[PDB]
Design a protein around this ligand. Structure first.
Ligand SMILES: COc1cc(-c2cc(C)c(=O)n(C)c2)cc(OC)c1CN1CC(O)C1
Length: 113
């Protein structure tokens, strides 16, 4: 395992503990959500992101943040605002971007000197 992999696994774990029922743990299927694929063209989930970290598919924290935003955006695009999925996606989005903020990544960048 590499330093970037270790850092991405930490961010992922801290994000995964916000989803207790595992609604974002594995991909959304047409069986679980009717006509999902007709609406969501670029699907994403925590499990897909885990495989990518392991496969060393992330060159930056930005690439990781982009797949995380994608996951939350898809849940807010498919589901209406009064649903449990939309509300959880909104909360985990705000949580991930506070945790992976410019101020936090800057403090980290400066600690690598
Ligand atoms: C992958 O797992 C599920 C994902 C969803 C889900 C549905 C929509 C529409 C949606 O946008 N997102 C993001 C997730 C719903 C599920 O069923 C209640 C499950 C089943 N699992 C949950 C565990 O408790 C059983």
């Amino acid at each position: 395992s590499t330093p970037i992999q270790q850092l991405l696994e930490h961010f992922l774990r801290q994000l995964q503990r916000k989803d207790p029922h595992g609604f974002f743990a594995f991909p959304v299927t047409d069986a679980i959500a009717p006509g999902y694929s007709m609406i969501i063209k670029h699907p994403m989930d925590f499990g897909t992101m885990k495989d990518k970290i392991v496969a060393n598919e992330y060159k930056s924290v930005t690439e990781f943040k982009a797949d995380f935003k994608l996951m939350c955006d898809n849940a807010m695009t498919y589901n209406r605002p009064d649903t449990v999925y939309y509300k959880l996606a909104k909360k985990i989005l705000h949580a991930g971007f506070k945790m992976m903020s410019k101020e936090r990544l800057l403090a980290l960048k400066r600690s690598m000197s």
